[PDB]
Amino acid sequence: GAMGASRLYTLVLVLQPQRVLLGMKKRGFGAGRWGGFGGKVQEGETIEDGARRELQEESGLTVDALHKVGQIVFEFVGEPELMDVHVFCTDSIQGTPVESDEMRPCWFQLDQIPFKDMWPDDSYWFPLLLQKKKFHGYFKFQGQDTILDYTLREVDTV
Ligand SMILES: Nc1nc2ncccc2[nH]1
């Protein structure tokens, strides 16, 4: 049958040559995991404007440019709506990260990426992001821990 409907999300990784900024989600879905900054795209909002807005809301940072690096679709058993996540990266930041209601920020060295406390899917696509390779992925989850199926491919255009 038809693919489920999807809600549009952004995810921003602040990735510098030696380190990445991650936020620990303090409450709600995925609480206790480190990850990038993002959220739902709003009505009438361009995807990149939503990415910038969510980065500022969750981390306090504003940035010059955002680069498209991949797309990941998430599906959860028992929920018919998919998450269509557009992933971006930025290197040049202005300002200092601030703890928000949603996120507590810490920098991680790129030989200390905290996979054990990140979403399981990150082990598959985060290495591609570090290699500056664009990707499309899909992950079906049972709950927050178990992957039942996934696809992943390198692309030349997000
Ligand atoms: N990396 C990553 N973030 C996520 N957020 C919500 C659901 C699944 C997720 N995987």
Swiss-Prot record:
Tissue specificity is:
Widely expressed with highest expression in thymus, testis, embryo and proliferating blood lymphocytes.
Q: Which reaction does it catalyse?
A: 2-oxo-dATP + H2O = 2-oxo-dAMP + diphosphate + H(+); 2-oxo-ATP + H2O = 2-oxo-AMP + diphosphate + H(+); 8-oxo-dGTP + H2O = 8-oxo-dGMP + diphosphate + H(+); 8-oxo-dATP + H2O = 8-oxo-dAMP + diphosphate + H(+)
Motif Nudix box per record, residues: 39-60
The consequence of V158A is: Slightly reduces 2-oxo-dATPase and 8-oxo-dGTPase activities and increases thermolability
Q: How is activity modulated by pH?
A: Optimum pH is 7.8-8.2 with 8-oxo-dGTP as substrate, and 8.0-8.5 with 2-oxo-dATP as substrate.
- Any one Gene Ontology molecular-function term assigned to this protein's record: snoRNA binding
Annotated binding of Mg(2+) 2, by residue: E54, E57
Question: Do you know which CDD domains this protein is assigned to?
Answer: NUDIX_MTH1_Nudt1
Per the record, the domain of life is Eukaryota
Specify the effect of E57G. Loss of activity
Q: Which residues bind 8-oxo-ATP?
A: F29, F37, G38, G39, K40, E54, E58, W119, P120, D121, D122
Q: How is it modified after translation?
A: The N-terminus is blocked.
Q: Where does N(6)-methyl-AMP bind?
A: T10, K25, W119, P120, D121, D122
Required cofactor(s) = Mg(2+)
Q: Write out the entry's keywords from A to Z.
A: Cytoplasm, Hydrolase, Magnesium, Metal-binding, Mitochondrion, Nucleus, RNA-binding, Transit peptide
User: What this chain does, per the record?
Assistant: Oxidized purine nucleoside triphosphate hydrolase which is a prominent sanitizer of the oxidized nucleotide pool. Catalyzes the hydrolysis of 2-oxo-dATP (2-hydroxy-dATP) into 2-oxo-dAMP. Also has a significant hydrolase activity toward 2-oxo-ATP, 8-oxo-dGTP and 8-oxo-dATP. Through the hydrolysis of oxidized purine nucleoside triphosphates, prevents their incorporation into DNA and the subsequent transversions A:T to C:G and G:C to T:A. Also catalyzes the hydrolysis of methylated purine nucleoside triphosphate preventing their integration into DNA.
Instruction: Report the family membership.
Output: Belongs to the Nudix hydrolase family.
State the protein's name: Oxidized purine nucleoside triphosphate hydrolase
